[PDB]
């Protein structure tokens, strides 16, 4: 009935295979520091470890599959805090215009640690655009990621 899904499960998984560059598959001060640092710098370590304990229910000091899924599945209809998605956007739009460009992204995607020529992205942004502007805006960004 649903055993043939594993679609969402596979999605998170890929996120762990992409975020975890070591091979353990867990969000830790290490994978967090490295990335977060290459995204917005990293102040101290004690603060990062304390921030992870304020959420780690068990105490492994890290996060696995159930805990991650739980971090998202565990929710409160409480007023939508788009501030999250919003912030995520700002990261993508580094400069400060609001829309994504071929060069802009290429810089953010290339810094993640992989190799994506200019063609791929170009084809990605294109499909993302249904009207015919050429660049991605907030409406298309929400209309595409929002699905329910």
């Amino acid at each position: 009935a649903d055993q043939l899904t594993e679609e969402q499960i596979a999605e998170f998984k890929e996120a762990f295979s992409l975020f975890d560059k070591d091979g353990d598959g867990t969000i830790t001060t290490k994978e967090l520091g490295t990335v977060m640092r290459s995204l917005g710098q990293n102040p101290t370590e004690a603060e990062l470890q304390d921030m992870i304990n304020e959420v780690d229910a068990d105490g492994n000091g890290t996060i696995d599959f159930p805990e991650f899924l739980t971090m998202m599945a565990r929710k409160m209809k409480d007023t939508d805090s788009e501030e999250e998605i919003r912030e995520a956007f700002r990261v993508f739009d580094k400069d400060g215009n609001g829309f994504i460009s071929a060069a802009e992204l290429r810089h953010v995607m290339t810094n993640l640690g992989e190799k994506l020529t200019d063609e791929e992205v170009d084809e990605m942004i294109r499909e993302a655009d249904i009207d015919g502007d050429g660049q991605v805006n907030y409406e298309e960004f929400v209309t595409m990621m929002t699905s329910k």
């Binding site: 999605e11 996120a15 992409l18 999250e84 990261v91 993508f92 990621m145």
Partner: peptide
């Protein structure tokens, strides 16, 4: 394929760990 999701979600994990800090106002 062209899923800005794994890319977004991923950043969502870290971005969330940055905001989890319940306002260090004090």
């Amino acid at each position: 394929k062209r899923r800005w999701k794994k890319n977004f979600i991923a950043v969502s994990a870290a971005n969330r760990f940055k905001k989890i800090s319940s306002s260090g106002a004090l």
